[PDB]
Amino acid sequence: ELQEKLIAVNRVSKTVKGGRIFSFTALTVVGDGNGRVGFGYGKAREVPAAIQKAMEKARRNMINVALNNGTLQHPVKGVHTGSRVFMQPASEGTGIIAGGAMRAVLEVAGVHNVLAKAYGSTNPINVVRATIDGLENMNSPEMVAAKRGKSVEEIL
Amino acid sequence: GQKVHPNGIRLGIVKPWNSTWFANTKEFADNLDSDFKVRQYLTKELAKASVSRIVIERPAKSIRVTIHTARPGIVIGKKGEDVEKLRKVVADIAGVPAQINIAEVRKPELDAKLVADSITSQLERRVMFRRAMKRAVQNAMRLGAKGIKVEVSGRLGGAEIARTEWYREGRVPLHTLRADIDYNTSEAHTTYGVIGVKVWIFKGEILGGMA
Amino acid sequence: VSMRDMLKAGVHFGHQTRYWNPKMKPFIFGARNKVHIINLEKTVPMFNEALAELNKIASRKGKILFVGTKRAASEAVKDAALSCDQFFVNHRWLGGMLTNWKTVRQSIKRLKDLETQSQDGTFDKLTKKEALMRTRELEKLENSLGGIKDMGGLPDALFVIDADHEHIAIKEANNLGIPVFAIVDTNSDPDGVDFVIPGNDDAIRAVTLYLGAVAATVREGRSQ
RNA sequence: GUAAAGCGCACGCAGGCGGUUUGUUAAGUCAGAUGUGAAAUCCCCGGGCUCAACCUGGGAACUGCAUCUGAUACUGGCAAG
RNA sequence: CGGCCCCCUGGACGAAGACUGACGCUCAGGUGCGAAAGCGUGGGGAGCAAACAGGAUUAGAUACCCUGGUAGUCCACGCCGUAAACGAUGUCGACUUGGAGGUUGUGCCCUUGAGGCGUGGCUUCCGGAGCUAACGCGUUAAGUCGACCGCCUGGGGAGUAC
RNA sequence: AGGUAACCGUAGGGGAACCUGCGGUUGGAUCACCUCCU
Ligand SMILES: [Mg+2]
Ligand SMILES: [Mg+2]
Ligand SMILES: [Mg+2]
Ligand SMILES: [Mg+2]
Ligand SMILES: [Mg+2]
Ligand SMILES: [Mg+2]
Ligand SMILES: [Mg+2]
Ligand SMILES: [Mg+2]
Ligand SMILES: [Mg+2]
Ligand SMILES: [Mg+2]
Ligand SMILES: [Mg+2]
Ligand SMILES: [Mg+2]
Ligand SMILES: [Mg+2]
Ligand SMILES: [Mg+2]
Ligand SMILES: [Mg+2]
Ligand SMILES: [Mg+2]
Ligand SMILES: [Zn+2]
């Protein structure tokens, strides 16, 4: 019942005594469509292996975000490795308006309505390195209430 | 870096011969000449019957040849009428009353001959060699093998240069004499030329000599 | 364990004042003869509260990994694990013992195959030199994975002696979320131990005290 | 810091910014009112051309400006520390 | 900025107090200082040494080597105002785990002695969080923050033309 | 003793490549290609 999506595949070199030896790095995310998602990235000698192993690491690392109703709970940004990502909840039925790399991440997590935008460099691994962190840093209307020792309406 | 025929060295150890009759020198050359000719005739005939192994053994008053294939009914046709006519044509090409018999194969994707020839056939189909040999090794190891190696050489995909490649998977111990290594070779005649294919399957170790 | 029970064993003993770690200041009674003295007033309640958690884990069918690689205390930790039907690491810790679980399972399978093969037979079929070589490999695997051949899966709790010496194990555990129970001398960094016991980790007497008390409470947790 | 980008260093006028308490002021600031901010346009709710474009009612809005009356925490002014 | 001595003179720091009562920070223009080379005037001139004079060597040597040797190098007084003038890091303030030092103070205790506990200033090296593209930085931040100034906008063309 | 280059400011020579003088800085080597989507 999971959900997966490849993001990008690059052919990386490695120069040896005689010439080089190419390889293949896959990058993918896996989510449950219910605010719980992880990502993976793994090299290999050829594509299906990389796409396979990277797919598996992502089955671990699956953090659980406290989104509400296919949308976030408050605007949020996340900066990692020179990539900046702004996101914010959107109205109902707005959709997933996001650059390529993020769109999958948002999709598999369970998000339905969200605005987004990247900044700086747009290296895909960096922005997901920069997105999931941003996601988990959301705060439920009770995570605060708990950590602020109040009732929900006492903040709302 | 040339290897040595993995079948040959394991003869007597774990690999029985493909011809078990005995004879003296006087009648030796012609003997293998005859059984060679019957091998060649057969391999021309049953090309569609997935034939893998063909052994000639000659008792003093008769000859008898045995066939390991994966398409038994094909060879038998109906009432062995094709089998019977093969028996006739071999009895005359061997000039000795023959008696042929077949012993089919159960794991057609697990012997080197059938897999190599299937590979080379698909190569004539101009399917992509890479995915082909990959399916080969996958089916093999999936079926319960312990090692598979395939190697294809010469003018790949019609390339104007000979890009010889290979693939390995599982475990194929080539220096361990006691190892059961099935091994075979076949060939494809492309428009662009001829391409060689070698195949190894390792079904594990056997302990206690040929017995 | 009572403060008097520890003190006679020497639990209060510590490393030199020259060699200590910054986070250990709360747990340090003071110094004498340039020697760090550990405070039993903190040691006893923390050990008791850790024993509570260990009893809980073992009383929900927990698998316990006793960890210590000291050449003096290896057999003590092994016997400690045997006294409570648990699993242990008494030889040098191998990186990825927990994180690289799949490889350990393949090595476990080879150890199981070798012992089964010797009982089944075919050693006579092997050349005498080959059969002896197989026996040597079986002995080496038994020396290495003797404790974890029957662990089956990743353990539910870890007990560590001299957490600084075994730092790779605790890093792995934290990466897996497996809880760490560890005897922490003054020179160790206590961040990786979720239930931290500050105490001597070299002295055979105090180590055996820790192990015996833990094993008694583990058998108690099992008995229900 | 090394990708372009810290003046060679210092002093210093103009300028910018300013610890802490009270009082005062009401300038900034905030609140309210009032005037004004053409119509069209844009937007909402309508209506009319068979639909639509288009045309049209009403509204919203025009974030502004001015004036008056308040508010005194904040920043400023004044006084006293 | 390096012999020693005197004379004239600036700053820093510590100790304890007493006084002043926000007198502050920053700073466009502005002003001054500003390595070496250079210029002017006069002096000086051992050593060294661009240029130059030769020797050699070299395809040739216009260079490298030798022998020389002027300006210069020094002094006074002007002038020039540039350097990878660099920590390639503007100035001031507050805050944020540690270890090893160096250096200069100063309190107490060792009876003091040799020494043990304090508490400053400056400085060096590790390294935590954190930060960084990375390298790294890391209480002397390139951390967390304020205030003010200077500066940047693809590379050459060009710090050149006017 | 380890040992050896670059570059800055400037002056002279030099046809220019550049070489010398004075001081300053470490920023104390040099390069790089045949195969390719699950
Ligand atoms: Mg040979
Ligand atoms: Mg500069
Ligand atoms: Mg100043
Ligand atoms: Mg003012
Ligand atoms: Mg003020
Ligand atoms: Mg209008
Ligand atoms: Mg209508
Ligand atoms: Mg005021
Ligand atoms: Mg000069
Ligand atoms: Mg002069
Ligand atoms: Mg000269
Ligand atoms: Mg300059
Ligand atoms: Mg300098
Ligand atoms: Mg500077
Ligand atoms: Mg100019
Ligand atoms: Mg010259
Ligand atoms: Zn210890």
Question: Which of helix, strand or coil describes residue C63?
Answer: coil
Q: Which residue has the tokens 């109902």?
A: A92
The CATH number that applies at residue C127 is: 1.10.287.610
Q: What is the rounded CA–CA span in Å between residue A112 and residue A124?
A: 21
The sheet with strand A76-80 has its strands ordered as A76-80, A83-89, A114-120, A96-97
Q: What is the rounded CA–CA span in Å between residue B34 and residue A97?
A: 78
Q: Which residue has the tokens 């769109």?
A: A103
User: Looking at residue B63, what DSSP letter applies?
Assistant: B
- Token code pair at residue C156: 């539910």
Question: Can you name the CATH fold of A64-148?
Answer: Ribosomal Protein S5; domain 2 (3.30.230)
- Token code pair at residue B148: 């598979």
Phi and psi angles of residue C118, each rounded to the nearest 5 degrees, phi first: -65, -45
B208/C125 CB distance under 8 A: yes
C126/B208 CB distance under 8 A: no
Nearest nucleotide, CA C18 to C1': E99
| Contacts of A136-144 spanning 24+ positions with Cβ under 8 A | A136/A63, A136/A65, A137/A76, A137/A78, A138/A65, A138/A66, A138/A67, A138/A72, A138/A73, A138/A74, A138/A76, A139/A66, A139/A73, A139/A74, A140/A66, A140/A68, A140/A73, A141/A73, A143/A66
- Experimental approach: cryo-EM
Q: What is the rounded CA–CA span in Å between residue A142 and residue C112?
A: 52
- With 0-12 / 13-18 / 19 or more C-beta atoms within 10 angstroms meaning exposed / middle / buried, residue B47 is exposed
Instruction: Return all residues near B46 (Cβ < 8 A) that are at least 6 apart.
Output: B67, B69, B74, B75
How many Å apart are B20 CA and F7 C1'? 86
Q: Which ligand has the minimum distance to the alpha carbon of residue B3?
A: 1
Phi and psi angles of residue B93, each rounded to the nearest 5 degrees, phi first: -65, -25
For A16, B39, B73, B93, the CA distances from B42, given in Å and listed in that order, are 50, 5, 16, 11
Looking at chain A, the domain(s) classified CATH 3.30.230.10 span 64-148
Question: Which of helix, strand or coil describes residue C132?
Answer: helix
Instruction: Return all residues near C128 (Cβ < 8 A) that are at least 6 apart.
Output: none
List protein-proximal bases of chain E (any atom < 7 A from a CB): 97-98, 132-134
Query: Where would I find the beta strands (DSSP E) of C84-176?
Result: 87-89, 157-161
- Token code pair at residue B88: 């006739």
- With 0-12 / 13-18 / 19 or more C-beta atoms within 10 angstroms meaning exposed / middle / buried, residue B160 is exposed
For B144, B148, B175, B185, the CA distances from B179, given in Å and listed in that order, are 16, 13, 8, 19
For A30, B60, B113, B201, the CA distances from B145, given in Å and listed in that order, are 33, 39, 15, 7
Residue C146 C-alpha from the chain's centroid: 14
Residues forming a β-bridge with B153: B196
Q: What is the rounded CA–CA span in Å between residue C44 and residue B81?
A: 93
Identify the domain containing residue C114 by its residue range.
101-145
Q: What is the rounded CA–CA span in Å between residue A4 and residue C69?
A: 42
User: What Å resolution does this PDB entry report?
Assistant: 3.6
Interior CA angle at C73 toward C71 and C77, to 5°? 125
CA atoms within 13 A on the CB side of C83: 17
Q: What is the CA radius of gyration of chain A?
A: 18
Nearest nucleotide, CA A121 to C1': E133
- Token code pair at residue A56: 């598996």
List protein-proximal bases of chain F (any atom < 7 A from a CB): 32-38
The Cβ of residue A146 has, within 10 Å, a number of other Cβ atoms equal to 10
Phi and psi angles of residue A126, each rounded to the nearest 5 degrees, phi first: -65, -45
Q: What is the CA radius of gyration of chain B?
A: 19
- Token code pair at residue A139: 């705060």
B207 touches chain C (CB under 8 A): yes
Å from C124 to nearest chain B CA?
10
Question: Which of helix, strand or coil describes residue B195?
Answer: strand
The DSSP-derived string for chain A is --EEEEEEEEEE--B-SSSB--EEEEEEEEE-SSSEEEEEEEEESSHHHHHHHHHHHTTSS-EE---BTTB-SS-EEEEETTEEEEEEE--TT--EE--HHHHHHHHHHT--SEEEEEEE---HHHHHHTTHHHHHT---TTHHHHHTTS-HHHH-
- With 0-12 / 13-18 / 19 or more C-beta atoms within 10 angstroms meaning exposed / middle / buried, residue C207 is buried
Nearest to B115, CA basis, from B176, B169, B35: B169
Secondary element (H or E) of residue B68 = strand B64-69
- Token code pair at residue A102: 């993020």
C125 touches chain B (CB under 8 A): yes
Question: Which of helix, strand or coil describes residue B208?
Answer: coil
Instruction: Return all residues near C196 (Cβ < 8 A) that are at least 6 apart.
Output: C46, C182, C184, C190
Which residue type is seen at B149? K
Whether C200 and C184 have beta carbons less than 8 Å apart is answered as no
Residue B59 C-alpha from the chain's centroid: 24
Strand F at less than 7 A from CB of A95: no
- List the domain boundaries for chain B: 16-106, 107-211
CA atoms within 13 A on the CB side of B12: 2
The Cβ of residue A121 has, within 10 Å, a number of other Cβ atoms equal to 11
Strand E at less than 7 A from CB of C22: yes
Q: What is the rounded CA–CA span in Å between residue C37 and residue C15?
A: 8
Q: Does the domain made of A3-63 have the CATH classification 3.30.160.20? A: yes
Q: What is the rounded CA–CA span in Å between residue A39 and residue A23?
A: 20
Chain B residue whose CA is closest to C121 = B207
Nearest to A7, CA basis, from A127, A120, A96, A114: A127
Q: What is the rounded CA–CA span in Å between residue C156 and residue C171?
A: 16
H helices within C121-188, ranges in order? 128-144, 167-176
Nearest nucleotide, CA C20 to C1': E99
